[PDB]
């Protein structure tokens, strides 16, 4: 399996970016496998 | 070797993720490459540091990205979706509250091949990578390593 990389752009902030998405506050746990899960 | 954001591809070709070149080091999420060597043109990039729990891996040298979300300001996901030009999506992060402290999180749901896309603060610094999270709709941690 040939895994390879290709450049896609500069890392820059863009003034005219679309804005979307909410800002939830979540209780989570992170296990040994790197998996986040919700906690109550 | 140029600084920037890169697609991670596999062979027809498929985009499996994204990563960040900075200071001669390539940064992506462990689950994107599982630590496999990467080709870059005629060159080869070998893994240097990786951690499954953080879900991060660096190639050619140690992890270089160290900026962190300030907890108040909007950020930008520099999403590089499969088949699409790199694009900036601005958002106010929420928070993952954990027993070991709080982590910024973005409630943005892009194709899986976008995993590894950088999240940026207002100065253009990479504050973490997109693509390890939970479902409530998907919410990604802002995953940052240690320099």
From TrEMBL, chain B:
Superkingdom per UniProt: Viruses
Residues the record marks as active site: 31, 55, 115
All copies of domain Peptidase S7, residue ranges: 1-147
Subcellular compartments: Host cytoplasm, Host perinuclear region; Host endoplasmic reticulum membrane; Host nucleus; Secreted
Quaternary organization: Forms a heterodimer with serine protease NS3. May form homooligomers. Interacts with human SPCS1. Interacts with non-structural protein 2A.
Function: Binds to host cell surface receptors and mediates fusion between viral and cellular membranes. Efficient virus attachment to cell is, at least in part, mediated by host HAVCR1 in a cell-type specific manner. In addition, host NCAM1 can also be used as entry receptor. Interaction with host HSPA5 plays an important role in the early stages of infection as well. Envelope protein is synthesized in the endoplasmic reticulum and forms a heterodimer with protein prM.
Name recorded for this polypeptide: Genome polyprotein
Organism (species): Zika virus (ZIKV)
Phylogenetic classification of the source organism: Viruses, Riboviria, Orthornavirae, Kitrinoviricota, Flasuviricetes
Protein's gene: GP1
Portion of the full-length sequence here: 1514 to 1666 of 3417
């Amino acid at each position: 399996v040939d895994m390879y990389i290709e450049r896609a752009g500069d890392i820059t902030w863009e003034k005219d970016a679309e804005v979307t998405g909410n800002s939830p506050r979540l209780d989570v746990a992170l296990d040994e496998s790197g998996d986040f899960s919700l906690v109550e | 070797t140029t600084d920037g954001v890169y697609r991670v591809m596999t062979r027809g070709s498929t985009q499996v993720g994204v990563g960040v070149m900075q200071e001669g080091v390539f940064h992506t999420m462990w689950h994107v490459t599982k630590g496999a060597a990467l080709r870059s043109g005629e060159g080869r990039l070998d893994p240097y540091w990786g951690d499954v729990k953080q879900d991060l891996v660096s190639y050619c040298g140690p992890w270089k990205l160290d900026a962190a979300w300030d907890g108040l300001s909007e950020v930008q996901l520099l999403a590089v979706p499969p088949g699409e030009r790199a694009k900036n999506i601005q958002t106010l992060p929420g928070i993952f509250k954990t027993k070991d402290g709080d982590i910024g999180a973005v409630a943005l749901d892009y194709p899986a091949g976008t995993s590894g896309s950088p999240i940026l603060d207002k100065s253009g610094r990479v504050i973490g990578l997109y693509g390890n999270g939970v479902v409530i709709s998907y919410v990604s941690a802002i995953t940052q390593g240690k320099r």
